[PDB]
Every structure is written in structure tokens, then in C-alpha cells.
Structure 1
């Protein structure tokens, strides 16, 4: 919600858009329907994948036995051990909990940014050839056939 698009000025999502994360709708006299934007979806899929790999795999791991056995005259060194185990417990629990919380915020905001950026890429091409009717929609002043919609999606629009 940091970029005001997802759940913001674009009020809802499309369950109808099954082939990707971000995309377009469009309505013609030749029909209508959904289409994902491959470039940004694939970029996001790629970025988020690197993110998950980083969190999962940058974790270094040493072969360790952990358990220790001390007799009833070694209580002090038994408690040192407990202190170590408990210390790492506290460190890992906290930084794990907060790592997920923080990365989760960042991830959702990342998606929000991609939607706002995509919306702006369209707005920028169309300029005053369409009117921003709100909710992420542009209404063309001219007549926009299938080849022309394809150009807006391509990023090829070309018209003052």
C-alpha cells in the first residue's frame, strides 16, 4: 500500500487474469478480456525467486552434536552449556521472526510498486489520447482495435 496502487486507486484484483501477476483488461468492438504483462511479471517472478533463495540458502550450516552430558558435580559447566543453547535460541527466534515480518512488508510493497509503475507506463504512452477514468482504467478518445491495444501492451503505441 506504500505506492497506493494495489488495494488503493486500483480497488481490487482480477481472478480472471490467470496467466500472470500484473496485466491489462481492454474492451473493443472485437470483444474484451484479460492478458498478463509478461515482462514485469517475469521480472517480479525472478526477483522474488532470488529473494526466497537468498533467505533459504545464505544460511550457513555446521555439523554439530548439540547434546552434552555432564555429571552432578559439573553443574556449572552444564549451565554454561544451557546458556549457550538458550542464547542462540533467543537470537535466532528474534531475528527470524523480524526477518519474515520485514521482508513481508517489503515484498507486498514491491508488488504495489510494479502495479503503479505499469499503470504509469500506460498513462505515459497514451497521454491525452485517452482519459483517466480512475480505478486503473483509460478510455480512448479514438477507436482502438486489437492491433492497437497490442501496441499499448507492447509499449509501442506511437501517437501524440
Structure 2
């Protein structure tokens, strides 16, 4: 949320995008289409897998410890045993609570960041040939068929090819 794309200027997610986490929808002369972006998807997944690698399957071996349940009343020594354990448990419980809250804030922010980065990259690529409509969509001011849209998604779009056409369309009356 801190970058402002997911749950921000992107109105909502796409339930029909099932082969990636981020991607592109377009409308042109040949129809309306959708394609996932693999690099942004993998960037987010890699980071989340990084967190998981640091939390899952990493336990600590302990063996003989202290007693933690007692059948008889004893006073001072048992009071101390119980307090040591209660102290420990509360500290670990705090660590767990904080860990999850911080990690989740960070996951939401890093995924928002990857959406924003893909948007910014696409904006720069289009140069003077498109305008940002404010909702994650670009109005492209030239004929842009399926191969042209593909060139944008693959990073091979040559803005100079279309610039005269686009400027004429943008800056008319």
C-alpha cells in the first residue's frame, strides 16, 4: 500500500489472471487480451520465498530442561521455575506476534512495489507515444497491433517508429 498502486491507483485485481501475479491487458484493432509478466511475478515470489526459507524448517533442538508442571505445593523454588517459564513464553509470544505483523506489512509493501515498478518501466518505454490515464492504463496514440503490444511486453518496442504518428494524434486540436 505504501507505493500506491495495489489498492490505490489500480482499482482492483484481476481474478482471471491465473498464470502470473502481474501483467497487462490491452485493447487494440485486433481485440482485447491479457498476458502475465513473468519477471515481476518472479521478483515478488523470490522475496516471499526468501522469508519462508528463514522461517520454515529451521527449528531448534532442546533436550533435558526444567520441570514445568508440578503435583505438590513447594514454595520458593517452584515459584522460580514457573516464573522463568512464564517469562520465556511471553517473550517468545511477543517475538512471534511482532515478526508476523512486520513481515506482513513488508510483504504487502513489496508486492505493491513490484506493481509500481512494472508500471513505471512501461511508462518510460512508451516515451511521448502514450499518456497515463491515472488508473494504471495508458492511452497509446498510434495504431498498435498484437505484435506491437507484444513488443511493449517484451521490451523490444522502438518508440521512434511510431513517434511522428503519436505526436500528431496527441497534439492536435
TM-score, with structure 1 as normaliser: 0.90
Runs of 4+ in 1 over 4 A off after TM superposition: 68-74
Q: CA 1:65 to 1:13, structure 2 compared with 1: closer, same or farther past 3 Å?
A: same
RMSD: 1.9
User: Bigger shift: 28-37 or 52-61?
Assistant: 52-61
Alignment of 1:79-158 (within 5 A): 79-158=79-158
Instruction: Please report how far the alpha carbon of residue 116 of structure 1 lies from its aligned counterpart in structure 2 after TM superposition.
Output: 0.5
Residue aligned with 1:32, SS: strand
Instruction: Please report how far the alpha carbon of residue 62 of structure 1 lies from its aligned counterpart in structure 2 after TM superposition.
Output: 2.2
- CA–CA distance in 2 between the matches of 1:119 and 1:139? 13
Q: CA 1:132 to 1:72, structure 2 compared with 1: closer, same or farther past 3 Å?
A: closer
1:115-146 deviation line (CA, Å, top 9, x unaligned): 01000010000011012112100111111111
Aligned twin of 2:164? none
- CA–CA distance in 2 between the matches of 1:23 and 1:71? 62
- CA–CA distance in 2 between the matches of 1:68 and 1:58? 24
- CA–CA distance in 2 between the matches of 1:63 and 1:159? 66
Which runs of 5 or more residues in structure 1 are unaligned? Answer: none
Aligned twin of 1:41? 41
Instruction: Please report how far the alpha carbon of residue 70 of structure 1 lies from its aligned counterpart in structure 2 after TM superposition.
Output: 6.0
Which runs of 5 or more residues in structure 2 are unaligned? Answer: 161-173
Aligned twin of 1:50? 50
Count of residues in correspondence between the two structures:
160
Instruction: Please report how far the alpha carbon of residue 56 of structure 1 lies from its aligned counterpart in structure 2 after TM superposition.
Output: 2.5
Q: Is the 8 A contact 2:68 2:82 kept in 1?
A: no
- CA–CA distance in 2 between the matches of 1:154 and 1:124? 14
1:59-92 deviation line (CA, Å, top 9, x unaligned): 5332355535767574322121111110111101
Identify, as 1 or 2, the structure richer in strand. 2
Residue aligned with 1:98, SS: helix
Q: Is the 8 A contact 2:129 2:142 kept in 1?
A: yes
